Design an enzyme around this catalytic site. Structure first.
Site, PDB file in Angstrom:
ATOM      1  N   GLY A  34       0.651  -1.147  -0.302  1.00  0.00           N
ATOM      2  CA  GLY A  34       0.038   0.104   0.033  1.00  0.00           C
ATOM      3  C   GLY A  34       0.473   1.459   0.235  1.00  0.00           C
ATOM      4  O   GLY A  34       1.744   1.410  -0.745  1.00  0.00           O
ATOM      5  N   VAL A  35       0.000   2.016   0.548  1.00  0.00           N
ATOM      6  CA  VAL A  35       0.796   3.750   1.273  1.00  0.00           C
ATOM      7  C   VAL A  35       0.650   4.210   2.317  1.00  0.00           C
ATOM      8  O   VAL A  35      -0.463   4.380   2.617  1.00  0.00           O
ATOM      9  CB  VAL A  35       1.313   4.088  -0.365  1.00  0.00           C
ATOM     10  CG1 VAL A  35      -0.459   4.486  -0.926  1.00  0.00           C
ATOM     11  CG2 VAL A  35       1.380   5.414   0.055  1.00  0.00           C
ATOM     12  N   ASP A 143       3.055  -9.856  12.670  1.00  0.00           N
ATOM     13  CA  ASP A 143       4.128  -9.015  11.934  1.00  0.00           C
ATOM     14  C   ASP A 143       4.803  -8.057  13.029  1.00  0.00           C
ATOM     15  O   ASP A 143       4.622  -7.323  12.053  1.00  0.00           O
ATOM     16  CB  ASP A 143       3.676  -9.014  10.245  1.00  0.00           C
ATOM     17  CG  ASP A 143       4.633  -8.167   9.720  1.00  0.00           C
ATOM     18  OD1 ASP A 143       5.954  -9.145  10.356  1.00  0.00           O
ATOM     19  OD2 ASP A 143       4.524  -7.046   9.059  1.00  0.00           O
TER      20      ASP A 143
END
Ligand SMILES: O=C(Nc1cccnc1)c1ccnc2[nH]c(-c3ccsc3)nc12
Length: 329
Positions: A34-35, A143
């Protein structure tokens, strides 16, 4: 200088999309997942981060669904979520936080220095709190890394973020295997517990003390070679399940003893968030005469909910000190 009004839906509450406007948009994150951009809302002026991911109508964004059911002071807060463009992009508007454990850890490394222990306690403790909270929902982050741990320098509050790789583990179902990776994962477990988060957190605590990644390896091989180069070789027993010389001199025993109970080959042998929170390494935090290195009052470290404690309530006797109660009465 460039406004953007969209139809956003509050992160928490009955779906009722209202018009939302924002500006000052400045990219601050990048990748293939993504971003992340920064921006200011116009009616409040508040700062926010917008995470834009590509989603397809075929299914539902798992990270959106997970974020929507979360609400804890130590987890990045979701404000709104909306779509943009054929191609559909899901945007998550989050309460902005200025730093990360990664940018801070690196900032200390370039000075050959090491982050003062008080700060390590403050950050690690709140991480275990975010963990204990989400694990009680059966939700595993999967994560954990310095990049994912946001923090506000002036308040000393840590907030877990990035649930794009998280999943609500359903005990009794197959989980496909697809430097913070727990060993059980390297051996492609398929029934691993949410205790993987504990291993990762262990690498983070270790790292902050050390001043560099503890298990550096471009692959599970090299990685596992490190785990062995420090934890030695596993026993047939542990294999199925699946020192003080390692840390820099002057490292508080409680810290080294804490990393040993997190970085265990046997998942079940490791502490759990709640237990970790009560570890004596954080005793100083439960101290009434404790002082936030910043002066401001220390963040709400004892406001535990019945949910956060469900893992083992009687542990509340330790996690919530005498003064914490009389002062919260
Ligand atoms: O959600 C965020 N970041 C993120 C990072 C990696 C993958 N997905 C999202 C985020 C949310 C709110 N405030 C934030 N502040 C930052 C930040 C600040 C300096 S470097 C990154 N990142 C976020």
């Amino acid at each position: 200088s460039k406004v953007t009004t969209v139809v956003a839906t509050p992160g928490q509450g009955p779906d009722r999309p209202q018009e939302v406007s924002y500006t000052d948009t400045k990219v601050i994150g990048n990748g293939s997942f993504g971003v992340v951009y920064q921006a200011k809302l116009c009616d409040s002026g508040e700062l926010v981060a917008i995470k834009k991911v590509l989603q397809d109508k075929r299914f539902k964004n798992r990270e959106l669904q997970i974020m929507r059911k979360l609400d804890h002071c130590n987890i990045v807060r979701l404000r709104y979520f909306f779509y943009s463009s054929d191609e559909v992009y899901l945007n998550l508007v989050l309460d902005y936080v200025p730093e990360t454990v990664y940018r801070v850890a690196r900032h200390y490394s370039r000075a050959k220095q090491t982050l003062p222990v008080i700060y390590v306690k403050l950050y690690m403790y709140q991480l275990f709190r975010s963990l204990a909270y989400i694990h009680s929902f059966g939700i595993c982050h999967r994560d954990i890394k310095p990049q994912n741990l946001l923090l506000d320098p002036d308040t000393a509050v840590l907030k877990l973020c990035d649930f794009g790789s998280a999943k609500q583990l359903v005990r009794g179902e197959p989980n496909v295997s697809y430097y913070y990776r727990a060993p059980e994962l390297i051996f492609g477990a398929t029934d691993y517990t949410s205790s993987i988060d504990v291993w990762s957190a262990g690498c983070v605590l270790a790292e902050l003390l050390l001043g560099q990644p503890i298990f550096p390896g471009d692959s599970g091989v090299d990685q596992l070679v490190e785990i062995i180069k420090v934890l030695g070789t596993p026993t047939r027993e542990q294999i199925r399940e699946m020192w003080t010389k390692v840390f820099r001199p002057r490292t508080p025993p409680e810290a080294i003893a804490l990393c040993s109970r997190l970085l265990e080959y046997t998942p079940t042998a490791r502490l759990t968030p709640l237990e970790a929170c009560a570890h004596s390494f954080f005793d100083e935090l439960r101290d009434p005469n404790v002082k936030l290195p910043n002066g401001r009052d220390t963040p709400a470290l004892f406001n535990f909910t019945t949910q956060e404690l469900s893992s083992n309530p009687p542990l509340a006797t330790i996690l919530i000190p005498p003064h914490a109660r009389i002062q919260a009465a």
